[PDB]
Amino acid sequence: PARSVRHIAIPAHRGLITDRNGEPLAVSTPVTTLWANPKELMTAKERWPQLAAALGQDTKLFADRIEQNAEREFIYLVRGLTPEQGEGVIALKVPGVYSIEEFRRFYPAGEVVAHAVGFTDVDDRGREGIELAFDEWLAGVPGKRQVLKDRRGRVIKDVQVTKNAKPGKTLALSIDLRLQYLAHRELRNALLENGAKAGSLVIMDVKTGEILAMTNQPTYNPNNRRNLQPAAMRNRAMIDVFEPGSTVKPFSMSAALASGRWKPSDIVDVYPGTLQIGRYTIRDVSRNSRQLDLTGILIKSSNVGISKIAFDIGAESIYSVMQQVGLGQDTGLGFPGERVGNLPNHRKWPKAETATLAYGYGLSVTAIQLAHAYAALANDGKSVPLSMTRVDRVPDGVQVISPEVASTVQGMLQQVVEAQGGVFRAQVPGYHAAGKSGTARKENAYRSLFAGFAPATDPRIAMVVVIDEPSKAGYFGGLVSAPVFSKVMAGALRLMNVPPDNL
Numbered sequence: 001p002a003r004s005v006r007h008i009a010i011p012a013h014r015g016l017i018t019d020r021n022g023e024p025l026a027v028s029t030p031v032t033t034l035w036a037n038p039k040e041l042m043t044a045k046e047r048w049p050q051l052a053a054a055l056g057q058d059t060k061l062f063a064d065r066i067e068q069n070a071e072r073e074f075i076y077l078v079r080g081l082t083p084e085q086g087e088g089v090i091a092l093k094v095p096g097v098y099s100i101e102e103f104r105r106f107y108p109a110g111e112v113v114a115h116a117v118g119f120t121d122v123d124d125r126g127r128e129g130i131e132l133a134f135d136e137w138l139a140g141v142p143g144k145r146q147v148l149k150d151r152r153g154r155v156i157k158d159v160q161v162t163k164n165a166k167p168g169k170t171l172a173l174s175i176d177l178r179l180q181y182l183a184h185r186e187l188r189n190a191l192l193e194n195g196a197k198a199g200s201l202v203i204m205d206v207k208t209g210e211i212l213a214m215t216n217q218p219t220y221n222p223n224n225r226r227n228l229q230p231a232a233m234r235n236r237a238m239i240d241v242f243e244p245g246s247t248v249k250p251f252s253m254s255a256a257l258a259s260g261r262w263k264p265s266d267i268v269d270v271y272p273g274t275l276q277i278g279r280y281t282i283r284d285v286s287r288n289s290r291q292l293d294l295t296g297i298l299i300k301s302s303n304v305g306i307s308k309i310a311f312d313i314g315a316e317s318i319y320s321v322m323q324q325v326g327l328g329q330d331t332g333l334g335f336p337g338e339r340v341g342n343l344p345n346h347r348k349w350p351k352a353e354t355a356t357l358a359y360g361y362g363l364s365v366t367a368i369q370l371a372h373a374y375a376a377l378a379n380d381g382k383s384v385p386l387s388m389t390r391v392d393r394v395p396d397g398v399q400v401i402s403p404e405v406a407s408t409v410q411g412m413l414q415q416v417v418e419a420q421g422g423v424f425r426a427q428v429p430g431y432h433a434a435g436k437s438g439t440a441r442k443e444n445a446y447r448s449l450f451a452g453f454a455p456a457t458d459p460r461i462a463m464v465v466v467i468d469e470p471s472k473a474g475y476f477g478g479l480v481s482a483p484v485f486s487k488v489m490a491g492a493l494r495l496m497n498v499p500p501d502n503l
């Protein structure tokens with residue numbers, strides 16, 4: 001062709017990601033894709049070796065590259081490059097060589113908030129995390145310019161900007177970067193001190209459904225993905241599922257206290273620390289108990305004790321409460337890869353299955369779902385829908401546990417933390433805190449769990465700590481996960497200026 005008119009799209013400035021307070025988490029930065037028309041390059045061949053030397057490329061490899069695709073009017077010398085480099089090569093004055101301002105994501109907080117934020121690909125398109133989930137919102141409208149081109153394809157003149165580019169829109173996350181840094185630091189230190197393989201920490205606003213912090217280990221630097229494992233990129237809080245074990249006994253207890261058949265001072269005999277359901281044997285971890293009250297059952301995490309309560313009230317009431325607090329249910333966060341886990345239902349709940357559900361096995365949940373459950377319980381039985389985006393207008397919650405029952409369970413979990421034989425390492429200096437330890441087995445390999453909230457008497461914050469496969473001789477949730485809860489809850493309450501309730 002003697003001439004032709006071609007589409008070139010005006011790229012959009014991709015929307016700024018901030019934290020709830022406007023700290024920048026993902027920032028669109030000027031770069032420049034050095035490109036070339038081979039057809040024009042093919043008539044300045046003595047200029048190539050210098051060009052190559054400034055693209056650092058091998059002289060003969062470069063020249064082979066330009067040769068093979070001589071016909072094409074387009075080739076990328078580099079993708080991205082500062083508006084600095086890009087000029088250093090423009091000032092060469094090589095025929096068929098140009099620079100064109102692009103946008104590249106920078107992530108100022110780096111590894112600290114990688115799983116939540118995720119990242120864009122070579123093309124400034126969301127690929128993981130918030131970047132993908134909210135791509136539409138963040139990506140603007142590419143505009144369009146009609147350009148007249150000579151025989152070779154060199155832009156002679158620009159005819160019209162027919163439709164300008166529209167910038168993408170700012171997104172403010174629920175994340176509080178200050179809590180996120182603290183959670184990140186303490187989860188990393190807890191892994192080191194226990195030689196654990198992995199972990200997750202979630203902090204929630206029990207009043208707004210906002211995720212204030214979501215950190216996992218291992219993590220990666222999104223600014224430098226060069227050499228990086230598939231494992232280190234798992235948002236484990238959202239896309240990994242586990243058996244919550246003893247951390248859902250409190251929901252089994254909500255059911256019990258809602259049935260009308262149980263009150264806290266009621267007694268269950270759990271002797272001799274085991275119980276046969278035909279060929280199946282329920283085993284307590286500790287087996288030096290006969291009579292325990294309902295608080296003791298939680299303090300001892302007695303599987304026998306919670307199974308006998310379950311046989312009494314029925315699996316249906318237990319299933320119903322766990323369903324309503326959202327365990328194994330769709331959170332509606334539309335996070336890429338986000339799991340729903342499994343809350344298995346039954347027409348006929350047999351005995352074995354009644355017991356396993358009640359003591360926290362046979363179901364699988366995310367750390368985010370468990371945090372959300374603990375939020376509902378902390379917010380006086382009222383579940384607010386989860387959000388990763390800042391909540392200005394808090395939606396109506398659903399009352400999923402009676403306020404009075406919620407209040408009783410709150411008081412019992414405060415005792416689990418504060419009473420003799422309790423999870424004393426979960427205590428939070430000059431606050432009342434409430435919560436529940438858990439330990440799962442997966443050749444002994446543990447998952448170590450703590451879920452709780454504070455302040456105990458007027459809750460603000462729900463927190464889950466999950467440490468995968470601690471390596472020292474301590475593996476119990478109350479040993480491994482509780483101290484991280486203590487430290488990160490104490491920090492979060494201070495940072496949000498929450499009044500101490502233990503004076």
Ligand SMILES: *[B@@]1([O])O[C]([C]C([O])=O)[C][C][C]1[N]C(=O)[C]C1=[C][C]=[C]S1
Pocket residue numbers: 244245246247283284285301302303360436437438439440441476477478
């Ligand atoms: B539960 O998940 O966690 C309890 C321990 C805690 O509160 O930290 C013990 C009972 C439940 N776990 C199990 O029964 C499975 C295990 C077997 C041996 C140690 S954990």
